[PDB]
Amino acid sequence: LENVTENFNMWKNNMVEQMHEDIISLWDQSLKPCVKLTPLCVGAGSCNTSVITQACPKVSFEPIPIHYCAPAGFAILKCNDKKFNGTGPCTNVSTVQCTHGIRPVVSTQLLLNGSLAEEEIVIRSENFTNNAKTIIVQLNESVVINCTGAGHCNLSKTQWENTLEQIAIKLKEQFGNNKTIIFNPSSGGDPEIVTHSFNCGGEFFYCNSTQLFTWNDTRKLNNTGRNITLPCRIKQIINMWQEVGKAMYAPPIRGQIRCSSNITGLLLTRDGGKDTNGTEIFRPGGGDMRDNWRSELYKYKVVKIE
């Protein structure tokens, strides 16, 4: 550990933007659409769409862990604490060569294969007061989730029920104990944000996460169900996360696509409610892959040599 006190701000961390831009370029030479459409305006309202048609090679895009080592004239500083807001003065900081192996998983609503919370479930937010700022949840115990191009994902109803609890409890432990915690599905928006979207085998899965976010701080949902089955769908025409615009990928082909990932975290986003009675409603969120990266770099910060 480094014997000094420094400031950290994962919400304004620059490595996030440095990885994000990398992960995008890690996408332009691995997953290339058959056609990519992107807004093109002079400002005069009228906006032509810039079209691009390239080969559409079916590649089973399988993410490789990524390290981030400071070159020279630069040093990475890691924060150490069982519960770090990731936005303030860190006491147990410590210089490191490369950040832990991170598997740049691009997804929405659920953070897959990320890094678990050592102690307990932690939830960071650039401002919990602002019903506009994504709440990044960090699970201390991942929940396996298996998706298949066959059309769905299975999740443990047990583990997911617990998780919502040990999350619902960490929420009120920030918005007011004497406050009811509820979970509802997406409010609306793009398919990629409304469902738990992500990529598996180069196939863009779109799983309906209603059964994962319709939890009332009162009842249950395990009648005749041992596992939660999200009705997933693979799309060819998708909205790009790298930049405003659609992109069409070629249909599936491999006799079988399969994924078994660790739900290591979520991206929630409680609704304003305009100071109404203690009844905070949290819904799935994300779509801004940087929050993802953040959830992984929340305790890092590269700095110039002295």
Partner: protein, 229 residues
């Protein structure tokens, strides 16, 4: 299960531009990708291009890039094919063809190259000639050539334009035992076909033979008495 309807056949002059319509009905428009396939007379299918409708993107044939465009009006449910700088060789029957793609309105898209649903076809004649009704000339029944059984006679629809032309004998009765030949393009820029009917000579002089030629384009319907002259 869609049904494709096309715009009318148009007679365009060299260096011009033509736009053929194609009404798509009977199903979800945006779930189809439409393709234009042209075919010159006597010639065979030539891929003109295809529009991934829903995406509003269209790719074209190399030898056409620049002079062709494919667009779709999702509102009216129509697809259009526009060729500019028309040459004579562009003269052909332009087919409208489509294929289902899947719940495209839902992100699913097969992006199929084949064409399951075809249009009725729209003919476009790109020539410097001018619209002009035909002229029917009777073909004297071989009276000094064939006998004993039956003799063949007919008509010679010469110098007509643009196309096409229908033919029937005896007001539409003797349509049997008749061989109406495909028209032929003359150096002038005009076409000319021929119709014939091998019928018994013993019926020459009682059944006044008359081929009924029509040419809606010029709006000129012609009837000619083929007397055993």
């Amino acid at each position: 299960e869609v049904q494709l309807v096309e715009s009318g056949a148009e007679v365009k002059k060299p260096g011009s531009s033509v736009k053929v319509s194609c009404k798509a009905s009977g199903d979800t428009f945006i779930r189809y990708s439409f393709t234009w396939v042209r075919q010159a007379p006597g010639q065979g299918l030539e891929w003109m291009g295809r529009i991934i409708t829903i995406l509003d993107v269209a790719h074209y044939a190399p030898h056409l890039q620049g002079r062709v465009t494919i667009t779709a009006d999702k509102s009216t449910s129509t697809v259009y094919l526009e060729l500019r700088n028309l040459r004579s060789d562009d003269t052909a029957v332009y087919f409208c063809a489509g294929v289902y793609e899947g719940e495209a309105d839902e992100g699913e898209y097969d992006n199929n190259g084949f064409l399951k649903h075809w249009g009725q076809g729209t003919l476009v004649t790109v020539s410097s000639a001018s619209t002009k009704g035909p002229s029917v000339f009777p073909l004297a029944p071989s009276s000094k050539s064939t006998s004993g059984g039956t003799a063949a006679l007919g008509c010679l629809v010469k110098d007509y334009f643009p196309e096409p032309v229908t033919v029937s004998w005896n007001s539409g009765a003797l349509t049997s035992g008749v061989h109406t030949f495909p028209a032929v393009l003359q150096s002038s820029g005009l076409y000319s076909l021929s119709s014939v009917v091998t019928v018994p000579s013993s019926s020459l002089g009682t059944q006044t033979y008359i081929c009924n030629v029509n040419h809606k384009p010029s709006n000129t319907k012609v009837d000619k008495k083929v007397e055993p002259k």
